[PDB]
Amino acid sequence: GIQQITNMCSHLQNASRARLGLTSLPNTKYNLALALALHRAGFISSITRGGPHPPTPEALMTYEPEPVTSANVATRRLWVGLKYWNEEPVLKELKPISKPSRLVTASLEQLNRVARGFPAGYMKGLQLGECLFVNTDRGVLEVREAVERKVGGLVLCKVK
Amino acid sequence: GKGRIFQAAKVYQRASEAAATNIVSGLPPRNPPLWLKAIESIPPAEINTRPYPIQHSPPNPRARKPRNLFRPTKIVYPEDELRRDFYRDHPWELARPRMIIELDGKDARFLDWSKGLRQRGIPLSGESVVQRQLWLMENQGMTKQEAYDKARHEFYKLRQLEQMERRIAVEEARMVGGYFGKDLLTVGMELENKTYESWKKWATTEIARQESARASMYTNVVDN
Amino acid sequence: ATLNQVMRGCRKPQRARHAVSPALSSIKSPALKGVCVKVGITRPKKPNSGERKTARVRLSTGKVITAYIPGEGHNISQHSVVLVRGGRAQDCPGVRYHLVRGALDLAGVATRMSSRSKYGTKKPKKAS
Amino acid sequence: ISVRRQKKLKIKKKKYKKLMRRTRNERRKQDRL
RNA sequence: AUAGAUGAGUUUGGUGAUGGCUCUGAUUGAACACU
RNA sequence: AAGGUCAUGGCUUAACAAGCCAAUAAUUCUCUUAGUCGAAGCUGAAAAGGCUGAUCGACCACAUUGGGAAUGAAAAAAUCCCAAGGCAAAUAGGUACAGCAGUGAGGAAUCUUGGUCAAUGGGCCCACGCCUGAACUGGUAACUUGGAGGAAUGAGACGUCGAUUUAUCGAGUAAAAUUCUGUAUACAUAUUGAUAAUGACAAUAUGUACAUUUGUCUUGACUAAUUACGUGCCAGCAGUCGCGGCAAUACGUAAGAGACUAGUGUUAAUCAUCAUAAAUAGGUUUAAAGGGUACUCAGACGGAAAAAUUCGCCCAAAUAUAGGGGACAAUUUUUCUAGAGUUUUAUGUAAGAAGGUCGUACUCUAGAGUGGAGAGAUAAAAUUCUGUGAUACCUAGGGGACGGGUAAAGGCGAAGGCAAUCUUUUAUGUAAAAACUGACGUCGAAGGACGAAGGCAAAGGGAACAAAAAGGAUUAGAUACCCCAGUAGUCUUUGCAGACAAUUAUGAAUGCCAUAGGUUAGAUUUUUAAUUUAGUCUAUAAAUGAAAGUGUAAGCAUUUCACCUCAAGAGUAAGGCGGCAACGCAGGAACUGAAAUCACUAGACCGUUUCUGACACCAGCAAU
RNA sequence: CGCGGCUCUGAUUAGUGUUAAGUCGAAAUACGGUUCGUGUAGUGGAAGUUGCACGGGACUUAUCAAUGUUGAACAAUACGA
RNA sequence: AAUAUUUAUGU
Ligand SMILES: [K+]
Ligand SMILES: [K+]
Ligand SMILES: [K+]
Ligand SMILES: [K+]
Ligand SMILES: [K+]
Ligand SMILES: [K+]
Ligand SMILES: [K+]
Ligand SMILES: [Mg+2]
Ligand SMILES: [Mg+2]
Ligand SMILES: [Mg+2]
Ligand SMILES: [Mg+2]
Ligand SMILES: [Mg+2]
Ligand SMILES: [Mg+2]
Ligand SMILES: [Mg+2]
Ligand SMILES: [Mg+2]
Ligand SMILES: [Mg+2]
Ligand SMILES: [Mg+2]
Ligand SMILES: [Mg+2]
Ligand SMILES: [Mg+2]
Ligand SMILES: [Mg+2]
Ligand SMILES: [Mg+2]
Ligand SMILES: [Mg+2]
Ligand SMILES: [Mg+2]
Ligand SMILES: [Mg+2]
Ligand SMILES: [Mg+2]
Ligand SMILES: [Mg+2]
Ligand SMILES: [Mg+2]
Ligand SMILES: [Mg+2]
Ligand SMILES: [Mg+2]
Ligand SMILES: [Mg+2]
Ligand SMILES: [Mg+2]
Ligand SMILES: [Mg+2]
Ligand SMILES: [Mg+2]
Ligand SMILES: [Mg+2]
Ligand SMILES: [Mg+2]
Ligand SMILES: [Mg+2]
Ligand SMILES: [Mg+2]
Ligand SMILES: [Mg+2]
Ligand SMILES: [Mg+2]
Ligand SMILES: [Mg+2]
Ligand SMILES: [Mg+2]
Ligand SMILES: [Mg+2]
Ligand SMILES: [Mg+2]
Ligand SMILES: [Mg+2]
Ligand SMILES: [Mg+2]
Ligand SMILES: [Mg+2]
Ligand SMILES: [Mg+2]
Ligand SMILES: [Mg+2]
Ligand SMILES: [Mg+2]
Ligand SMILES: [Mg+2]
Ligand SMILES: [Mg+2]
Ligand SMILES: [Mg+2]
Ligand SMILES: [Mg+2]
Ligand SMILES: [Mg+2]
Ligand SMILES: [Mg+2]
Ligand SMILES: [Mg+2]
Ligand SMILES: [Mg+2]
Ligand SMILES: [Mg+2]
Ligand SMILES: [Mg+2]
Ligand SMILES: [Mg+2]
Ligand SMILES: [Mg+2]
Ligand SMILES: [Mg+2]
Ligand SMILES: [Mg+2]
Ligand SMILES: [Mg+2]
């Protein structure tokens, strides 16, 4: 559910606030889709599902995980490599917008306005560096990736 | 938040920006500090970033949500088990003074434990028995007990000859007119005398105080 | 407050603030006519000192209020029809109204040269 | 609340508690207890 | 409709907050006073 | 089952069945207020913005108030029927200006008792035409808006005035004067509103002609703009802070300056300011604000991997026909085990309850006790106990409640709270291993239950303590603090009562973030000492906070419930509910203010701690 | 005609607001000179004060009778503040 | 080591 996305948003903030090189996340389809989007934007370094212990750092991306069956599904966990540049984290803030108490949806007409620094609906304009992620029929895209594809949908989080 | 903000990792960035433009607009910037071009191509290293430390022992494969993932682990070798076993059977082997200060750190380049206990650079110690034991237990496929006996027995025969030389050397020297100084036995007794005397004084002084206290404790206020 | 608490009507209006001139603010009136019941003097509060000319007026609505007489010298007394406007004497408690000096019975200051409009005084008419 | 401000409310509750005892007999006759 | 988002005076020995009040902007089917 | 209907529906009927809607107010009742809505008006940068509900359009209701029906295609009437009061009327049986103009009244406040049906619209009419207080036009009111309301030149009239350094600074290009224009407007002509014909009144175009007022507020700061004189906490000013007490930039005059202008200020109101009721978008440790507690109906929220349906969500609208996309969402289905639970007697443990007991002291009685004048109280005393033999030291019985050590930053329960002991009885919780169920979870208005001490009620108990009442002291007085005594009450049983600094001044719960030193109950191990699970407590990092500080949270987030919206009045009034009562729940407004309020900082003070100097004191001598 | 509601008035009476200059005490803030407050029940001209339980928004304000050691001689070309 | 008299007022 959306509660997993809120717990994920806050965890990645606490992990970057603690300057951790690695971080773990529950293995869920929803979490993976947002993680891939963050990776496609350059905010995180790696994505890999494994056990309760992190894989070998030297061969992280080469680590071949075992099949995820019902015998070990409860132990699986997604391991994302955090990014830090110039004495600052690349994933400082991950303020969510859609919460369990209310799922905020945006239209294509609103995303076009928000992508250029103008409020629309329950959202606010994007500034330099900020990034917005929308869950659409074509996967969890970026607000600017959803504008070229001409689709709207659920607004997940806002990255600064 | 009491601590101050250290921007030492950005001195080049800050200093370089301050030298890009001049305060007085319209004029060329003055020459920068002499160190700006020295560290131009030597940026600092990433600090304050907790990585996954080296695992010196297999982590618990049963933990479902383990903690202390960013905590350095203890270094444990197979010899640690043997060292404890040997030095417990030979406790007085620790009284033998052993030097841990290293001269050049290259003492491991000439240690071939296939020859025997006696090596180059290192003294005959309980460590030589452990390494010799470990070698036999690995190459010659010996058991912990068997290899222990072999390396342990070679250790005794070498220690015996060292204790026999001291006696035969002194006796031999005196047969040709060789005299020595005070032995450790006599020197040890003389020190005990000086310390025992100091205790005799303290006991004598304290004994006086206790008996004097008794006189004052008893009531002799009126003499009849 | 959660969303469910806002559905049930938790956002109620802020408590009302008493107006400066309730008699006028209530009925949305800029002024009111009244008959003076008493013309006396009021004593200022702690810091100030003096004598403020006040008049107990009975408005056409029925309420009895205490108005202030601006200017120097007045010609109103018991049973005088005077006009009342909002305001207040900041150093006199209870005096929350003023009296127009160019009103029905109250006459404007005759020897006034500055801010004649505030005191209902006609131009001296010297060169006219 | 500070002790000083609480003493302000301690004095209001005591005088009210004291007023009702004084007026208890009068309130009983008027059937207002 | 992509330019549209602003403050000020006043609590304290003093500082920083909390919090009201008033002022600055626009207006009325308005009234009154001087014109 | 039958009729009816284009069709559908107890629409209608017969015969059976006992259902249907709702459970948190469906439904009904009382009170207060109101015509409703629209970018229609005003306002904001903005919010599904806020306010208003004039002129404009749509809708609803009404025509003195109340009670009613018919006619008609259709009530859609300023009609009609009945009643009452006002006016009028008498043998009458009318009238109600919320139709236009107008009068009186009320009010701070809002117009002419005009012309015409020429234009537009409507009614009657074969036609012509008649009628139209709708409507079109003239009048009144700076109420508002728009426009006009004058431009250029203007140097020594070697004049005038105002200040004042008596020679400097202004009035001042200002004026006069000169040169042009002909704006509002007046007059004249033409066209036009209208055409088949009809012009009430006016607009437009052209021509000629005319150069006509200033007014008001402000001037300490906010807030643009100064002196002099007068007054002397007086008179007065004031939107806020404030000014005035004999040399006032704040009051009243004079002049100057700043600004708007046929308007200018003031008062009243609305929006914004104000994230100052925060859906967008707030907050509740110490500043307004976490409920006494958590079991829990309703209601909100809540796993993993697939599938069906909705086509929610999106393209995407115009309240969009028909489709497409499938991440997410809703109902549902099948599987999974990380959440939540169950079994395997855990250990440990002052949760709770029942029936019994133990002991240290106290208290009463007895012994014809020993002893023979004091004891007890307090800073000191008094009241008081004692020769009817006290206190003190014993023996033997009776009677009540209390719980020493162990004991700790310790533990246990939802909280309140729970500490001697045996037996009986009771729900959670914690650790390790496997096994099992397979999202069965969290929060939770209300209802119900529990809820300290004190208190009410009934029946017991009654040693000790002790409100009250009373006495003795202290004291200027002493209800009081101290003392001799002492009743309710504390205790048992059964009910009521429900208020607490019921506290971690911090609701519960979930996910998450770096270390260190102790400590509690377990587990694992090379059980010496190290790992580890669940608690608790100190000191820190990042961070957070107004700061104090917190840092297993007062951090990052999330869910949910309760509560707050300046102070004071006030947790008060009135009505209501609960209770035997005491009181509790719930809960305003009027009047009055510009401040209330929190944390910190440096001082000062303390019948505050510890030091340091001084004939400050002690001691001695001398003196008053 | 009765019952109930509402509005106005009411001899008499209560509370509260405002008002530098008044009278009586000295309750609070320091250990405020009896620790202060919470609840409950009494009591006194008034502030107050008493019983019982609770809270710290008061005692973490905490700072040695463990009194502090001949911890391997001396001498050499070793050693050399 | 468990001491304890009395100390009001200041436009
Ligand atoms: K004031
Ligand atoms: K609480
Ligand atoms: K579809
Ligand atoms: K199953
Ligand atoms: K915070
Ligand atoms: K009241
Ligand atoms: K007291
Ligand atoms: Mg002037
Ligand atoms: Mg509070
Ligand atoms: Mg202060
Ligand atoms: Mg009405
Ligand atoms: Mg209307
Ligand atoms: Mg009428
Ligand atoms: Mg009329
Ligand atoms: Mg009138
Ligand atoms: Mg006509
Ligand atoms: Mg005609
Ligand atoms: Mg016609
Ligand atoms: Mg005709
Ligand atoms: Mg003209
Ligand atoms: Mg100025
Ligand atoms: Mg003035
Ligand atoms: Mg002030
Ligand atoms: Mg003046
Ligand atoms: Mg105009
Ligand atoms: Mg309650
Ligand atoms: Mg409470
Ligand atoms: Mg779909
Ligand atoms: Mg299984
Ligand atoms: Mg489990
Ligand atoms: Mg047990
Ligand atoms: Mg005798
Ligand atoms: Mg006796
Ligand atoms: Mg007993
Ligand atoms: Mg407790
Ligand atoms: Mg005990
Ligand atoms: Mg527990
Ligand atoms: Mg629950
Ligand atoms: Mg409840
Ligand atoms: Mg009780
Ligand atoms: Mg009781
Ligand atoms: Mg009884
Ligand atoms: Mg008494
Ligand atoms: Mg007494
Ligand atoms: Mg007693
Ligand atoms: Mg009960
Ligand atoms: Mg709760
Ligand atoms: Mg611990
Ligand atoms: Mg504990
Ligand atoms: Mg701490
Ligand atoms: Mg209040
Ligand atoms: Mg009441
Ligand atoms: Mg209440
Ligand atoms: Mg201080
Ligand atoms: Mg002296
Ligand atoms: Mg002396
Ligand atoms: Mg009366
Ligand atoms: Mg005192
Ligand atoms: Mg005291
Ligand atoms: Mg008390
Ligand atoms: Mg308690
Ligand atoms: Mg204190
Ligand atoms: Mg403290
Ligand atoms: Mg004083």
Short mmCIF file of C-alpha atoms (C1' of nucleotides) in Angstrom, two decimals, chain C residues 1-6 8 10-12 14-15 17-18 21-22 24-25 28-33 47-53 60 68 70-73 83 85-88 90-94 96 111-119 123, chain F residues 106-108 214-218 233-245 251-254 264-270 276-280 282-284 299-300 560-570 589 591-594:
data_model
loop_
_atom_site.label_atom_id
_atom_site.label_comp_id
_atom_site.label_asym_id
_atom_site.label_seq_id
_atom_site.Cartn_x
_atom_site.Cartn_y
_atom_site.Cartn_z
CA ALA C 1 -6.72 17.88 13.52
CA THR C 2 -7.21 14.85 11.30
CA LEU C 3 -9.37 14.96 8.18
CA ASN C 4 -12.17 13.06 9.95
CA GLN C 5 -12.19 15.65 12.73
CA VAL C 6 -12.61 18.42 10.16
CA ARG C 8 -17.55 16.74 11.81
CA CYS C 10 -14.12 21.23 14.20
CA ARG C 11 -13.25 24.49 12.40
CA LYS C 12 -15.66 26.82 14.16
CA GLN C 14 -13.18 32.54 16.05
CA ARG C 15 -14.75 34.20 19.07
CA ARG C 17 -14.19 40.77 19.23
CA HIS C 18 -16.18 43.49 20.96
CA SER C 21 -19.04 51.34 19.34
CA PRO C 22 -21.41 48.38 19.80
CA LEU C 24 -23.49 51.57 16.04
CA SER C 25 -21.64 48.42 14.96
CA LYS C 28 -24.49 48.82 10.77
CA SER C 29 -25.09 52.51 11.43
CA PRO C 30 -22.50 55.29 11.02
CA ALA C 31 -24.26 57.60 13.48
CA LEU C 32 -27.30 57.78 15.73
CA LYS C 33 -29.42 60.56 17.19
CA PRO C 47 -1.45 58.07 33.62
CA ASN C 48 -3.60 60.96 32.40
CA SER C 49 -5.22 63.69 34.48
CA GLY C 50 -7.90 66.28 33.86
CA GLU C 51 -11.63 66.51 33.21
CA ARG C 52 -13.26 65.10 30.08
CA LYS C 53 -16.63 66.54 29.06
CA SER C 60 -33.16 56.43 19.34
CA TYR C 68 -17.51 62.43 24.47
CA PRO C 70 -14.82 67.17 21.51
CA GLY C 71 -13.54 70.72 21.39
CA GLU C 72 -13.46 73.57 23.87
CA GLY C 73 -16.81 74.65 25.28
CA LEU C 83 -25.93 63.33 17.06
CA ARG C 85 -20.80 58.88 16.14
CA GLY C 86 -18.30 56.13 16.80
CA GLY C 87 -15.00 56.56 18.58
CA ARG C 88 -13.78 56.37 22.15
CA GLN C 90 -8.89 56.06 25.33
CA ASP C 91 -8.29 57.34 28.89
CA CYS C 92 -11.93 57.19 30.05
CA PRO C 93 -13.60 53.81 30.69
CA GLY C 94 -17.15 53.54 29.40
CA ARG C 96 -17.00 54.70 23.70
CA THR C 111 -13.24 80.49 17.66
CA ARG C 112 -11.79 77.48 15.81
CA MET C 113 -9.38 78.02 12.92
CA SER C 114 -7.64 74.63 12.58
CA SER C 115 -9.41 71.50 11.33
CA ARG C 116 -12.78 73.23 11.21
CA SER C 117 -14.41 70.21 9.58
CA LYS C 118 -13.64 68.08 12.64
CA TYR C 119 -15.45 70.60 14.88
CA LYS C 123 -15.12 79.70 7.69
"C1'" G F 106 -39.82 56.05 11.79
"C1'" G F 107 -34.59 56.84 10.76
"C1'" A F 108 -27.83 58.87 10.50
"C1'" U F 214 -10.41 76.63 -4.85
"C1'" G F 215 -11.33 73.55 -0.88
"C1'" U F 216 -9.80 70.05 2.76
"C1'" C F 217 -6.58 67.07 5.92
"C1'" U F 218 -1.86 66.42 7.93
"C1'" C F 233 -1.00 66.94 34.16
"C1'" C F 234 -4.95 73.06 33.50
"C1'" A F 235 -7.49 73.82 28.86
"C1'" G F 236 -7.07 69.94 25.21
"C1'" C F 237 -5.02 66.16 21.42
"C1'" A F 238 -5.32 60.79 20.35
"C1'" G F 239 -6.16 54.95 14.77
"C1'" U F 240 -1.74 52.38 18.07
"C1'" C F 241 2.36 53.64 21.38
"C1'" G F 242 1.41 58.32 23.94
"C1'" C F 243 1.76 64.19 24.82
"C1'" G F 244 0.70 68.50 28.74
"C1'" G F 245 3.45 69.26 35.80
"C1'" C F 251 -2.31 70.87 23.07
"C1'" G F 252 -4.38 76.29 21.14
"C1'" U F 253 -2.95 80.48 17.55
"C1'" A F 254 0.47 82.55 13.36
"C1'" U F 264 -11.24 66.28 1.32
"C1'" G F 265 -11.45 64.15 6.04
"C1'" U F 266 -14.34 61.47 9.92
"C1'" U F 267 -17.77 57.46 11.47
"C1'" A F 268 -19.93 52.43 10.28
"C1'" A F 269 -19.23 48.04 7.52
"C1'" U F 270 -16.78 44.06 4.12
"C1'" U F 276 -5.55 34.83 13.49
"C1'" A F 277 -10.36 27.87 13.14
"C1'" A F 278 -4.56 26.16 8.92
"C1'" A F 279 -9.11 20.80 3.35
"C1'" U F 280 -4.52 23.20 0.36
"C1'" G F 282 -1.28 25.09 12.27
"C1'" G F 283 -0.44 23.51 17.09
"C1'" U F 284 -0.97 21.05 22.44
"C1'" G F 299 -16.48 4.81 11.98
"C1'" A F 300 -11.39 6.01 9.93
"C1'" U F 560 -6.17 7.65 14.86
"C1'" C F 561 -8.89 9.87 18.91
"C1'" A F 562 -9.27 14.01 22.40
"C1'" C F 563 -8.39 19.22 22.92
"C1'" C F 564 -6.81 24.70 21.89
"C1'" U F 565 -7.70 29.73 18.97
"C1'" C F 566 -5.73 37.32 23.21
"C1'" A F 567 -6.42 38.55 28.40
"C1'" A F 568 -10.01 39.04 32.01
"C1'" G F 569 -15.29 37.83 33.15
"C1'" A F 570 -15.20 32.00 33.62
"C1'" A F 589 -23.07 36.21 26.81
"C1'" C F 591 -19.66 44.96 30.73
"C1'" U F 592 -13.82 46.28 30.70
"C1'" G F 593 -8.90 46.20 28.55
"C1'" A F 594 -3.71 46.39 24.89
#
